[PDB]
């Protein structure tokens, strides 16, 4: 026995806040969180306690410390099959990572509609509010490898596998409502331009390099998604606080065969929230697993990620009613024109047991649809349907990837397909072909119908010549970027400016920066001028004179495009650093933690060393991390309670803690003598909005703090931060 | 016709300093650099200028912007083979990364021995000082994925492929002289313990988590290499400024049949230099590609990485003359007892053309030896021999990985092996077996001999029973960690204490921190008490009385174990930040640059925006990066010239640049009114060692600054940094 006497090696199997317990495989953490998919995985879950260590062939190992050798200082013998099996498995552990979205973090959960959608779709999983569909959701970045950092500036993926009674439906979306390019044929070109450059494989997790900006400068269709990426959309605070979108127009098909154009949305019930660039970038170094950690910890704490599924619905007769093409995936559908109808809720409530087996091996593919859904001619979606099947043949080693446990349907699957590498299913059917008489033609085709019917494509009319040609209706590149720009708040606009400015400064060939600045002048002159000024570029007369693109169907903005214009901040699951001293006023701390608890806000108690400190009244306070070990980057606000403030007053790390949080626009609260830290961040005696201060941490001081936290960041502080050396 | 008219898209094909030009593929950057291996790759190099865009079957493509569809808004057609070939290739770009050492950066070079070593080895590549051997060297971290960050704390790999006239020899070493474990059977245990934990795949690039320290606390044999990893050896400044070691005892075999034991060494001719922890961590965020970029840029500049091959040589009859077992890979051979004999020089002087083709596909394996070398019974080496062949079968797709161009021998290779996936060689031999008469038994066996002879193993005596048993002579864990500790300077000991303290503070289960502290108590009490204090742990009276381990063969220390005890700095290839203002005194700048050029030191000119500023006298100064864009982390020293200081005096970023460099112990030089910045880093009027100051940059402001850079960092500043909030 190697475990400690007191059992402190094993985390409690009950929900606990971030950092109170060691994290654990989801079935050991939350053994009674069940869904039909989790239950069906029980046939392959393997335990460990009380079992003998064995080879893979079931032979018990006596000595797992030593190779077999001739003499105890002799050569290793070829007949050591225990060593070789163990080393062979190790030698072959890795499989190819995903071509794109290789970095991702996943969890199990469930979906339930708010109401029957049978009027617009025959999809069985939307037929009844009491129908619960298990899901497995993987969130991801796009550019970086599986080992890259989470808080990069990038698009994020948001892929949901629905295990429905009528097939797996995979909704494979991103956190912006469009993509960079129009036609799938260009996907390898765009992806090669953004990925590490081929001679030296730099940079990882970054669009901030010559080839990306070269491609963008030569392909103005990219400008819309580039605006999204350069805004704070590209740096979410958490996968829980970002939107999701299918990107493409798909179709719903009802029992009568009527088709309705649909775009899919996921609305985060924790609201929208993003980092600021300096904080995100520094966070890639301080914790490159920050989002992966934050997701896994939210679920272990019972702060389940929740999203509302939304449909923007457009009748078939309305295909041509907008001044952009519905099938152009570089164009969004403003919610002011077509509202998002809220259709159901998805809740992510259990982490995987084994990351490699369930997350790394999961296969999501937008061609995985079910009766009641169909495709459109969107030329980016069309070519996707080829790729997500093809790519699995090397990534997951052959065509039986659907037999990998996480990928298996929970509903029946039977057909005449046979063999392939690592074939699991042993078919007993005398027939492997149809039509057959020898098994009475089973399994049999099923006619399309209102429920449990076979899949039939919507009989869309196709008229034209075989051509490699972009639709003329796709040839407008500037008006959606502008609509997005005009819908941002002024501080969101300034961060977009800073995102282009920072990125372009890392482009080595100056003519690329100039060409990009030209494209910005086609979108908005104020934007183009602001970025030009940060690059030392002067706009020419021609450029000052470029007529702005037209409004989108008469819209001069749509506030649903902003992260922050319409407040939807939720503090549950956020985190505050509390900076301790060696004699904390226990009364400040009691009230603080009580008020945070009431709102579901977590706390990490921080000090200049590990172990514990003792409060004025003798309460022993355990330390979660040092100031340097858990930087302000990792929290949403900072409180400094009263006590022996002299203990920390001269600590560089504790002062810097506050400077960093201040620079990144986080709320700061200072009680009693903690107000002496106002000097480090240059706050006037009379105080400032976003700095909470009081003689003690009374009820009012906490309400003020928690109000600021609901608004996420103190945007009004931005003009004070450039004087601050941090 | 998309290139700019002025040709500025194309990097100058001649040596230029970091940042002056875009980087490029080696064969375009340095077309005149050659060696035998680079010449032999010529048949697979593919050009591009003036060629048509084609399919892989050579069919010219007319439209590479669109898929083939029925009507320009219609569905994509299955008959578009140009689209499917291009997506198919993209879909299968990725191959499995290396189980360990997945993150690495590589270059071509050559090796030449100083003199014939024929008296001690018949290895052809060591036989003649005129004999030049091409090499390809890949440096790496160990734990993180291929997309993880460079400046992590980790062991580093240093692998060299020698393309000799008698076979490929791979010398597959690391940057410390030992390993964590004794027997290869445990390799998957240790590697699993250090790698991201299996439920959630966290943390990347870091040993700072519970499973690593649980294994260490249960396996004291690990403590030697842990000491190294926790010292500044764990965070080198550059692959150019670290040592390399083969780790194991191997044999040399001369023409007479005499065996001599040998341990391999690489000495960096640029000297030994490491980062400090806070700087290394933050740098994984600001530039996760910093070592890869630095290596590529040094070679493009002509600062070729150079290393001296050295041997520690022990006669067979001295096998048992030490306090430790020569075969135990957790033990080092102190240079005090067995000096390193210099053998030859290696220069890395060309970057690859394609990172994937040459770096990612390169296969190094220490079983690749040549006649004149042989193995020993080291039980970690012994097991390695199995792994590096086996692992290539999945990583590189089959047994023909030696035909991938980078892996090919430059010397003849002929045998009776056939077939296998992606077989390139087309064999014309009528025979595929021997003995044969039908091809007169060719290719033929060759007897061993003084040169050009067949491989024969040295006839070592083996005697004992078939056992899975550790040699008792390996059962001593603490003496080498202690010898390591006592050989370090007091500031190096401080950094070791801080590395244990930081990592252990991230271990969630406290009993594990306590168990590790109990292990440090067996090594050295001062070390153990200093880590304990940082962790709030108190040593027991029993722990305080642990007798220290014996010295190693009479040694109370060995200064060759310290990075810094014996100065060996070299400033060539280092970089200085120069913080500009809008009216720079140009006499200061001429003097600065002239002095830096004279020592081969680079400079990057930084401002608050990109573009240019104009000096007092109309000299236009191009700006390389912004203060935020190229942080102090990325440079070795900072110089602030005189001019309009009021321009930058209240710029937060400019002040913080100096505070960050100050904290990280970098030399800082201030001229004239730039002395105003002394207030931000809290320097007294009369000055301090490590801050160079004067009315103007002369003559001997530059000699002082450069003397400080030669010493690398200002260690004496350490007591001052805790105060500073940065
Ligand atoms: C034809 C090329 C192509 C096209 C144009 C796109 N994708 Fe894709 N995508 C792939 C080809 C691909 C892929 C190579 O097939 C991936 C990588 C590995 C895999 O399993 O699928 C993938 C992965 C992938 C993932 C990760 C799924 C996972 O977590 O495993 C997401 C979320 C998206 N894609 C989303 C999108 C969106 C929203 C797109 C446009 C609206 C888009 N992709 C266009
Ligand atoms: C028995 C397993 C085993 C053991 C005990 C070791 N290695 Fe290893 N090593 C492997 C099994 C392995 C490997 C799985 O075979 C790798 C990864 C994939 C590859 O091509 O080789 C590898 C890669 C690898 C690399 C990277 C090569 C490259 O750049 O591609 C280096 C530098 C080392 N190792 C160095 C060492 C050192 C100095 C060791 C002890 C002194 C050591 N390894 C012990």
UniProtKB/Swiss-Prot annotation, chains A, B:
Broad class of enzyme this protein falls into: oxidoreductase
UniProt key word Cytoplasm: yes
Domain of life: Bacteria
Reported induction: By entry into stationary phase.
Annotated region described as Disordered, given as residue ranges: 432-466
A Gene Ontology BP annotation from the UniProt entry: hyperosmotic response
Disulphide-bridged cysteine pairs: none
Cofactor or coenzyme needed: heme
Protein EC: 1.11.1.6
Catalytic activity annotation: 2 H2O2 = O2 + 2 H2O
Annotated compartments: Cytoplasm
Molecular function as annotated in GO: catalase activity; heme binding; identical protein binding; iron ion binding
Subunit and partners: Homotetramer.
Job description of the protein: Decomposes hydrogen peroxide into water and oxygen; serves to protect cells from the toxic effects of hydrogen peroxide.
NCBIfam families for the chain: PRK11249.1
Stated family: Belongs to the catalase family. HPII subfamily.
Protein name: Catalase HPII
Species of origin: Escherichia coli (strain K12)
Gene: katE
